[PDB]
Ligand binder design. Structure first.
Ligand SMILES: [Zn+2]
Ligand SMILES: [Zn+2]
Lengths: 132, 137
C-alpha cells in the first residue's frame, strides 16, 4: 500500500494540530495532492476515516485538491509546467503514425455506431441537511 | 450553459429542503458526465450565487464525474472508455522507443536539454487546512 503511509502522515498531522490547539473536535480537513501522485484518493479517505475513528477527528469532512505540477531548470532557469512536457511527448506518438478508428468504434465488431449508456448526465447524487 | 444547469440544481436542492422542513443545507454532491464539456468552477460559482441569502448559503459543493459507458447498437456490446484509452497506453508503452523517448520528453528541459532540473509544485501531499472547534476560557 501507498495510500496508508499517506493517511498516517495526514492523520498524524491533523491530530497533532488539534491537540496542541485544545480543540473539542476536528470538523474539516483539506488535503492537497501533487498531480504527480499515482495514488487513489478514495483509498486515502477509507484509510483516514478509519484512523480518525474514536478520536476528536471523527465525522470530519475531507476535501482533496490538486497542486499543479511545475519545475525549474537550474542551468537555463527556464521554468515550466507538466503540460508542456505532455504535448512534446504526445507529438512523438504522432510520428509513430498512430488510433482514430479505435476511439470511435465498438471494439468487438467494427461497429462505429453506438449509444451512450453513461456519459453526458448531470443529477444530484446527494444532499446533506439539518432539521428539527 | 451553466446559469441554467445551476438553476435546475438550486431548484432541486432548495425544493428538497422545502418538502423536508430543513433549517439549513450543509453540502451538495453533484455528479457530472465526462462527456459534458462544462466549466466546473463556473457552475459552482453560479450555485453559490443562487444560494446566497437562502438556507443553503455556504454549503460545501462536491463534484463527482460519471464515466462514459457505450453500448454498440449493432452487436449490443457495452464498453467503458478506460478500456480503449488504457490500451493505447499499453501499446505505446511496449515500443522500444518508449523508455528512451519518455526520458527525452520528461527528464529534459525544453529550453536547452539539460537533465538537472528542480521541482517546485508537484510531489507531496500536505494538509492545507484544518477546521476545528474550541471551548477555551
Ligand atoms: Zn533548462
Ligand atoms: Zn459492436
Amino acid at each position: 500500500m501507498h495510500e496508508w503511509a499517506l493517511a498516517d502522515a495526514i492523520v498524524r498531522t491533523v491530530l497533532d494540530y488539534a491537540q496542541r490547539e485544545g480543540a473539542s473536535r476536528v470538523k474539516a480537513v483539506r488535503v492537497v495532492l501533487g498531480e504527480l501522485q499515482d495514488v487513489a484518493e478514495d483509498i486515502v479517505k477509507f484509510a483516514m476515516e478509519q484512523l480518525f475513528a474514536g478520536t476528536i477527528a471523527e465525522g470530519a469532512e475531507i476535501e482533496f485538491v490538486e497542486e499543479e505540477a511545475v519545475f525549474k531548470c537550474r542551468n537555463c532557469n527556464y521554468e515550466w509546467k507538466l503540460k508542456e512536457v505532455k504535448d512534446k511527448f504526445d507529438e512523438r506518438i504522432k510520428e509513430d503514425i498512430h488510433v482514430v478508428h479505435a476511439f470511435l468504434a465498438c471494439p468487438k465488431c467494427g461497429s462505429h455506431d453506438f449509444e451512450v449508456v453513461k456519459g453526458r448526465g448531470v443529477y444530484v447524487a446527494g444532499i446533506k441537511i439539518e432539521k428539527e
